[PDB]
Amino acid sequence: GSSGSSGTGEKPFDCIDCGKAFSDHIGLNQHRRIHTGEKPSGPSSG
Ligand SMILES: [Zn+2]
Numbered sequence: 001g002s003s004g005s006s007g008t009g010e011k012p013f014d015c016i017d018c019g020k021a022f023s024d025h026i027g028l029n030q031h032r033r034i035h036t037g038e039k040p041s042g043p044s045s046g
Helices: 025-032
Strands: none
Touching: none
């Protein structure tokens, strides 16, 4: 849950996995580490 509409800023590196934002490639990739590794099991993903 994010607040504040105005004042978004520049963040081309936004995690598409969860929807986070980052102002640096390294910062983003380093964060994706939480998603990269474990995948959805079962008949369907979601
Ligand atoms: Zn993320």
